[PDB]
Design a protein around this ligand. Structure first.
Ligand SMILES: CC(C)(COP(=O)(O)O)[C@@H](O)C(=O)NCCC(=O)O
Ligand SMILES: CC(C)(COP(=O)(O)O)[C@@H](O)C(=O)NCCC(=O)O
Ligand SMILES: [Mg+2]
Ligand SMILES: [Mg+2]
Lengths: 248, 248
């Protein structure tokens, strides 16, 4: 009566695997996405993590932003569970997609919007801090578009690889107004700076659309949770959206 | 007389070569920095550009943030001009250096501060939009530190290389509150976002140090000059600093 579902969020750096028996409580694991990985390699990684739960999975739902990985997920589902996964995509129904090319919207973003409309309301701004940081706007149940920024690690890594002199700095907020050494300069510019970037984008949105609730999610969100004004902090938002899209 | 000086600003992507006979007006050229270049290669590039001026250079001053390039500049100066270049670095004198390790401050930043204190006064905030975007604070003739952010091109390139689905986008401001396609999303997050990031960092500096004049400079600054509030726009700031540091 409470069948188990596996929800997958394939990101550029990491993939999230979650199981639920009700779509209300979720157990989560995370693995590297890994370029040339196979279906057997995925099973091998998941086996000690899911344990007994493995053989209880009755459906698999996936949001993926890495097309090359999709055949691996497909083969894994078919080989180990004798089912095909259900793929999150922008489509008509519960959300109206008021953008130029809805098919080009990343599946994670689609999942976030679906979860938002299902669980939170018809109006809101979603901030998802991952490999990239995204802003997504929903007004009266219509997706209106958003913004894409490099994520925190992407930023510090870009400064490292892209200059002769700069080191790779740890992602940690600055508790100072000006940096007094190179590492501090980078923390201020990247971490606090990205926070200000987001607050400026959100502010301009709210000028046009009013005081919408802000939800924060993503693998890199906890570090700056207390620096961005938000009404909701929901680390499971994407997985919930995968669940709602695939299994209602 | 009015002897001619060559000023060099060696950056991570490009190097600026400029001549002046008075330290007020500059003729400038830009070349790629280029990893494996030699002194003869540099001379070959500069020959058709400087023309007769090559014969007239009496002094060479350099700010470099690419240490591997420094031997090329040294050899070029010695072979073609029979002189050693003068190297911009942080040292005590007309600027006090109120940071933990002044010797680590990039030579371009040092040059910017020197130029600022010579021409624009004892107090200011310098924004240099280059490969990286820097903020530098000068208070009562003392360098206080700053911030470092990825530059615009660095950001869009990082999104392109760091994800499966994102294209390489042209750097241009967003003219809209949310993006309605991928390109527009990235312009909003990177260009408008970085402007907001800078304004937040600068706003917080001003809360502590007062409303100091802002100077804007750098190879990527023109595209956003009508978007960032500034008292001074001076594309020659770094080269001016090289001149003042080396030749007064
Ligand atoms: C912007 C993203 C890279 C975020 O992905 P992630 O941080 O999850 O790896 C992804 O949503 C994506 O590839 N989007 C396609 C472009 C778009 O949504 O406009
Ligand atoms: C921050 C910089 C990379 C800017 O360089 P550019 O944009 O000129 O290529 C450079 O000033 C630098 O290497 N600085 C050393 C670190 C510091 O100033 O603390
Ligand atoms: Mg392994
Ligand atoms: Mg050549």
């Amino acid at each position: 009566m409470d069948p188990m579902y596996l929800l997958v969020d394939v990101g550029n750096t990491h993939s999230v695997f979650s199981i639920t028996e009700d779509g209300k409580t979720f157990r989560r694991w995370r693995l590297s996405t890994g370029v040339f990985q196979t279906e057997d390699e995925l099973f091998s990684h998941l086996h000690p993590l899911l344990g007994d739960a493995m053989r209880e999975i009755k459906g698999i739902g996936v949001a993926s932003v890495v097309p090359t990985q999709n055949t691996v997920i497909e083969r894994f589902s078919q080989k180990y569970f004798h089912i095909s996964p259900i793929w999150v995509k922008a489509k008509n129904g519960c959300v109206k997609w008021n953008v130029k090319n809805p098919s080009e919207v990343g599946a994670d973003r689609v999942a976030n919007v679906v979860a938002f409309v299902k669980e939170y309301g018809k109006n809101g701004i979603i901030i998802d801090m991952g490999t990239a940081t995204t802003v997504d706007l929903v007004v009266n149940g219509s997706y209106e578009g958003g913004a894409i920024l490099p994520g925190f690690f992407m930023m510090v890594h870009s400064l490292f690889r892209g200059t002769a002199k700069l080191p790779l700095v740890e992602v940690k907020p600055a508790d100072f107004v000006v940096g007094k050494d190179t590492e501090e300069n980078i923390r201020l510019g990247v971490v606090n700076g990205s926070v200000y970037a987001l607050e400026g984008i959100i502010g301009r949105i709210k000028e046009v659309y009013g005081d919408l609730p802000v939800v924060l999610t993503g693998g890199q969100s906890k570090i700056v949770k207390d620096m961005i004004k938000h009404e909701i902090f929901d680390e499971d938002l994407t997985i919930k959206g995968v669940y709602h899209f695939c299994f209602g």
